[PDB]
Amino acid sequence: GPNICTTRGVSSCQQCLAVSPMCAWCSDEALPLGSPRCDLKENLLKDNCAPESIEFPVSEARVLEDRPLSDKGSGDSSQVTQVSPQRIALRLRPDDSKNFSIQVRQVEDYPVDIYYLMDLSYSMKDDLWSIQNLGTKLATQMRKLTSNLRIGFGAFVDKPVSPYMYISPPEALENPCYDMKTTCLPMFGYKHVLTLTDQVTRFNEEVKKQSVSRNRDAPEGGFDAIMQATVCDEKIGWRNDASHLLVFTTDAKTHIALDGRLAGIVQPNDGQCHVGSDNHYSASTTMDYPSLGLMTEKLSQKNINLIFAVTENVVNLYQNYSELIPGTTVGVLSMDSSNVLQLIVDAYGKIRSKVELEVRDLPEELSLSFNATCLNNEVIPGLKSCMGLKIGDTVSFSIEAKVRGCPQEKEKSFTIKPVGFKDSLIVQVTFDCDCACQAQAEPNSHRCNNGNGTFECGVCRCGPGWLGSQCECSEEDYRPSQQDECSPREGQPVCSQRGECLCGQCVCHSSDFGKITGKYCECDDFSCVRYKGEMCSGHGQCSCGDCLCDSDWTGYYCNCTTRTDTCMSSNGLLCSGRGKCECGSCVCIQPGSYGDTCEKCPTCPDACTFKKECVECKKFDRGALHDENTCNRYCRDEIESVKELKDTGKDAVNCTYKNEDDCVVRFQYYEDSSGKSILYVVEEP
């Protein structure tokens, strides 16, 4: 009957739901302060509260929308779908949870939007020349990955300001390379040239039309260019139903956030688009560089993968930046850039080998635990991702959505999406902690029989100044009567020490360092045994001084674990199969075995007196292992009969025993037959 909420939720209909998923509470005077309250649904149900007055909400896992996952990227009309659930309805109760799953496929033939963002520093003039054959060739090789690929183009040459640019010391650097019998272009920060197009032959021509500029400061403006290419969807030509590949091609180290201080650039980068009608970054002289933080958030939020097509001698910085820009990839570029075709095809294949989920707008009170199915039906806990996938393969994530306490009565949208994917799961989450009869309540002073109080969930509830079992003994004074069962067995305390009986219920006057709950002031939130300066070492919660252990802990002080890896032996058996596990350690078995797993046993009757027991049952149907029906699993040794126990010359133990039939049987116990235990039992005892 009396279980948890018996003492913890009786004072409040919201509290009983706050306290435990098993509790219910009747209304409409079904059990008009009969005796038990809250308890378990089933106890009230049996004690005349079977009708739906019980106010017993349950948690639920429902799917609002499940458009089926698609096999092919070109399969337009119905939107090509990359994940299975689309919209999910989640209903929680306090300290409860529900499971769901996320199926994600690396859909085959999925369209590709690729932008070629080029380093336009003078060392690249021969690259622009080599690249004259790309676009056409890049797309051609990519036709195998997908039938639909678009190619765009842009460039960067660093911020056109005093310390980066040759400062325009003279006029001569307004249109540079006058220094070396040639001509080249001025510095522009970031430029956009070609939006993404299916007419990829346009790239061949657009790159031939370009030429390089001069940079004094070796570090590149590549981070502004990446961020703008990443952010400016409207010009870059990113279509949401496509993978976005930003290819960054360069021969040099990048310039980063707050380095811009040298040019008087101190304005924070807000991660916004600043490219105007001239397809030019107008912020190139006023805004600083984006941080690794900003790049990561914007490319993740908008599903842009970055490919670093970087020459060999600077790879160390790009690889290290990618570690701090998750989801990106870095390859090695040839000095003539002829391998961009291959670099990109492999970079794409690498990008599509990882499935990773991110949850947007997740509230502080909810915890989403993941177990990721990386292979077959095996799941690894603590993972938002799986590695080693091919295009056309799937990944399956198991998610547990748990809520702590009782968060506010608002509907929140948890967006669970693979990174780089447009499709996402919207989980719509609400919290059922109220009783319907909590809202359907009209306190109104009167109605609590003859009195002044409140009313909820089918019963009256007089507050301070009126209290009583129903409506009486405001501050005692009608109290020196009625007695009542204020304590078990009528042992006559006023109320279990910390409290006093008040007209059928006790009132706890204590208000120091915690709370007291229950009819007889039974539950002390603050009073239990410390293990090392803390109640039960922080490995459980207390209720009435009784500590309720957490997962994988036991004992009064919750310091005895139920974890067994520390008492497990090298053979996979707890206590090596000969001993008892206790508090993460091992209790010695009678023959005299010793050590953490009973590894050593110098006294132990030789194995022959333990192995005969197996032979005696597996072959002769006698012994403890026969009577206990245990030999078949206990003895995993191979036992063979032989006509003769031969001079093997190897590690064979000569064992012997006299049986129930007054016969003497000899056998040999041989160790390490390619890791197996082999017994040779004479056919003729």
Partner 1 sequence: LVMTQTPATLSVTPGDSVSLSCRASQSISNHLHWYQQKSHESPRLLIKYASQSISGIPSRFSGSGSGTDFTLSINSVETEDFGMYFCQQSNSWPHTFGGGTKLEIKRADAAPTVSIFPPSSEQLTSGGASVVCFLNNFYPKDINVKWKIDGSERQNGVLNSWTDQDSKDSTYSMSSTLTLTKDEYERHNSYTCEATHKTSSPIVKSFNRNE
Partner 2 sequence: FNLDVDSPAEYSGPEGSYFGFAVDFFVPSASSRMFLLVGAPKANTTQPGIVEGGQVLKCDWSSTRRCQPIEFDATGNRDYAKDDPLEFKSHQWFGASVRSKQDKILACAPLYHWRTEMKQEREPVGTCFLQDGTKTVEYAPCRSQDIDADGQGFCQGGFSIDFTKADRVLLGGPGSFYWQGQLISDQVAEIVSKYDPNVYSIKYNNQLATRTAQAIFDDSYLGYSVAVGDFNGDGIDDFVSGVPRAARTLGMVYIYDGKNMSSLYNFTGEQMAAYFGFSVAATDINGDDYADVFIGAPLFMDRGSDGKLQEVGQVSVSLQRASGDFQTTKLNGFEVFARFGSAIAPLGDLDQDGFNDIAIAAPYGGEDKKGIVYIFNGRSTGLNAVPSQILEGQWAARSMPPSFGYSMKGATDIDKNGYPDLIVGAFGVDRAILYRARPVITVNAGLEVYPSILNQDNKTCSLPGTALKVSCFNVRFCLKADGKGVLPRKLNFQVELLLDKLKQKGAIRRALFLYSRSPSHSKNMTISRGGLMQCEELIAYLRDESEFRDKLTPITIFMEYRLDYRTAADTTGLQPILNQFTPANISRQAHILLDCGEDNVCKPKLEVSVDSDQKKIYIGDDNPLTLIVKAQNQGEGAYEAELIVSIPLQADFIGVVRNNEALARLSCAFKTENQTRQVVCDLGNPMKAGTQLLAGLRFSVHQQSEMDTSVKFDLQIQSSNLFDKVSPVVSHKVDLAVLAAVEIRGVSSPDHIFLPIPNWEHKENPETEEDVGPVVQHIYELRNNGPSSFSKAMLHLQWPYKYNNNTLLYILHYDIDGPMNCTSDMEINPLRIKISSLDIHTLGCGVAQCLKIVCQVGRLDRGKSAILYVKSLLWTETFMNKENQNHSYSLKSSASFNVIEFPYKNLPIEDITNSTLVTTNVTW
Partner 3 sequence: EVQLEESGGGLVKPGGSLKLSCAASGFAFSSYDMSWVRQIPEKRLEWVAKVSSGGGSTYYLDTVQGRFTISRDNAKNTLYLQMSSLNSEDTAMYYCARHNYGSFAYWGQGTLVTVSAAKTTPPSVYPLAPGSTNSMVTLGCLVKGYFPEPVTVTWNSGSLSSGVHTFPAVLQSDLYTLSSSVTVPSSTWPSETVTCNVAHPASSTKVDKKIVPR
Provide the 10 A C-beta neighbour count for residue 484. 14
Stretch near partner 2 under the rule CB under 8 A, chosen from 63-71, 167-175, 340-348, 632-640: 167-175
CB 164 within 8 A of CB 221: yes
What's the residue count for the chain? 685
Nearest-angstrom CA–CA distance, 682 and 664: 10
Residue 418, Cβ density class (10 Å: 0-12 exposed, 13-18 middle, ≥19 buried): buried
Using CB distances below 5 to 8 A depending on partner kind, what does residue 601 bind out of partner 3, partner 1, partner 2, none?
Answer: partner 2
Task: Report the site for partner 2 in 177-216 (rule: CB under 8 A).
Answer: 216
Residue 345 or 653: the one with the smaller Cβ distance to partner 2 is 653
Using CB distances below 5 to 8 A depending on partner kind, what does residue 251 bind out of partner 1, partner 3, partner 2, none?
Answer: none
Tokens for 6?
């018996």
Tokens 């960054």 correspond to 248
Q: Is 179 near partner 1 (CB under 8 A)?
A: no
CB 383 within 8 A of CB 371: yes
Nearest-angstrom CA–CA distance, 153 and 197: 10
Q: Is 178 near partner 1 (CB under 8 A)?
A: yes
Using CB distances below 5 to 8 A depending on partner kind, what does residue 175 bind out of partner 2, partner 3, partner 1, none?
Answer: partner 1
The count of chain residues that interact with partner 2, using the rule CB under 8 A, is: 85
**Binding map of partner 3 across residues 163-182, x = CB under 8 A, - = no contact:** ------xxxxx----xxxxx
Residue 293 or 388: the one with the smaller Cβ distance to partner 2 is 293
Q: Is 304 near partner 2 (CB under 8 A)?
A: no
Task: Report the site for partner 2 in 308-327 (rule: CB under 8 A).
Answer: 316-317, 320-321, 323-324, 326
Nearest to 120 by CA among 215, 212, 192: 212
Nearest-angstrom CA–CA distance, 196 and 237: 5
Tokens 């180290």 correspond to 253
Stretch near partner 2 under the rule CB under 8 A, chosen from 65-73, 260-268, 405-413, 625-633: 260-268
Residue 89 or 601: the one with the smaller Cβ distance to partner 2 is 601
Residue 27 or 474: the one with the smaller Cβ distance to partner 2 is 474
Q: Is 445 near partner 2 (CB under 8 A)?
A: no
Residues 6+ apart with CB under 8 A from 75: 109
User: Which residues share a beta bridge with 414?
Assistant: 427
**Binding map of partner 2 across residues 224-253, x = CB under 8 A, - = no contact:** -----------------------------x
CB 645 within 8 A of CB 668: yes
Annotated ligand binding at 118? The verdict is no
Residues 6+ apart with CB under 8 A from 492: none
Annotated ligand binding at 123? The verdict is yes
Q: Is 657 near partner 3 (CB under 8 A)?
A: no
Beta-strand ranges (E) seen in 350-422 are: 355-360, 366-375, 378-381, 385-386, 394-403, 412-418
Nearest-angstrom CA–CA distance, 616 and 625: 9
Stretch near partner 2 under the rule CB under 8 A, chosen from 72-80, 239-247, 412-420, 597-605: 597-605
Residue 480, Cβ density class (10 Å: 0-12 exposed, 13-18 middle, ≥19 buried): exposed
Nearest-angstrom CA–CA distance, 414 and 366: 10
Q: In whole angstroms, how close is the CB of 179 to partner 3 at the nearest point? A: 7
Q: Is 483 near partner 2 (CB under 8 A)?
A: no
Annotated ligand binding at 335? The verdict is yes
Nearest to 84 by CA among 70, 103, 71, 65: 103
Nearest-angstrom CA–CA distance, 171 and 417: 53
List 511, 551, 570, 674, residue binding partner 2 (CB under 8 A): 511
The count of chain residues that interact with partner 3, using the rule CB under 8 A, is: 10
List 315, 391, 529, 678, residue binding partner 2 (CB under 8 A): 529
Tokens 């949850």 correspond to 359
**Binding map of partner 2 across residues 382-421, x = CB under 8 A, - = no contact:** --x-------------------------------------
Coil, strand or helix at 443: coil
Q: Is 514 near partner 2 (CB under 8 A)?
A: no
Which residue type sits at 307?
I
Cα three-residue angle 406-407-412, rounded to 5 degrees: 140
Which residue type sits at 158?
D
Annotated ligand binding at 127? The verdict is yes
Q: Is 169 near partner 2 (CB under 8 A)?
A: yes
The count of chain residues that interact with partner 1, using the rule CB under 8 A, is: 9
**CA quadruple 543, 544, 546, 547: dihedral sign:** positive
Using CB distances below 5 to 8 A depending on partner kind, what does residue 594 bind out of partner 3, partner 2, partner 1, none?
Answer: partner 2
CB 590 within 8 A of CB 610: no
Q: In whole angstroms, how close is the CB of 464 to partner 2 at the nearest point? A: 3
Annotated ligand binding at 627? The verdict is no
Residue 170 or 572: the one with the smaller Cβ distance to partner 2 is 170
Using CB distances below 5 to 8 A depending on partner kind, what does residue 179 bind out of partner 1, partner 2, partner 3, none?
Answer: partner 3
Q: In whole angstroms, how close is the CB of 140 to partner 3 at the nearest point? A: 40
List 594, 610, 620, 634, residue binding partner 2 (CB under 8 A): 594
Q: Is 445 near partner 1 (CB under 8 A)?
A: no
**Binding map of partner 3 across residues 178-217, x = CB under 8 A, - = no contact:** xxxxx-----------------------------------
List 132, 183, 313, 562, residue binding partner 1 (CB under 8 A): 183
Q: In whole angstroms, how close is the CB of 489 to partner 2 at the nearest point? A: 6
List 175, 320, 342, 656, residue binding partner 1 (CB under 8 A): 175
Q: In whole angstroms, how close is the CB of 206 to partner 3 at the nearest point? A: 30
Task: Report the site for partner 2 in 104-123 (rule: CB under 8 A).
Answer: none
Residues 6+ apart with CB under 8 A from 399: 99, 100, 101, 102, 368, 369, 370, 416
**In whole angstroms, how far apart are CA 228 and each of 56, 187, 255, 272?**
54, 17, 15, 8
Stretch near partner 1 under the rule CB under 8 A, chosen from 166-174, 253-261, 583-591, 630-638: 166-174
**Sequence-ordered alpha helix ranges (H) in 537-641:** 608-618, 624-627, 631-634
Q: In whole angstroms, how close is the CB of 212 to partner 3 at the nearest point? A: 16
Nearest to 23 by CA among 99, 51, 36, 506: 36
Nearest-angstrom CA–CA distance, 135 and 209: 14
Tokens for 33?
């302060």
Characterise 303 by phi-psi region: left (phi > 0), alpha (psi -120 to 50), beta (else). left
Annotated ligand binding at 220? The verdict is yes
Q: Is 74 near partner 2 (CB under 8 A)?
A: no
Alpha carbons within 13 angstroms on the beta-carbon side of residue 463 total: 9
Q: How far is CA 224 from the centre of its chain?
A: 33
Residue 435 or 508: the one with the smaller Cβ distance to partner 2 is 508
Residue 180 or 548: the one with the smaller Cβ distance to partner 1 is 180
Stretch near partner 1 under the rule CB under 8 A, chosen from 165-173, 263-271, 436-444, 556-564: 165-173
Q: List residues near partner 3 by CB under 8 A.
A: 169-173, 178-182
Residues in contact with partner 1 by CB under 8 A are 168, 170-172, 174-175, 178, 181, 183
Cite the annotated binding site for Mg(2+) by residue number: 121, 123, 220
Annotated binding site for Ca(2+): 123, 126-127, 158, 215, 217, 219-220, 251, 335
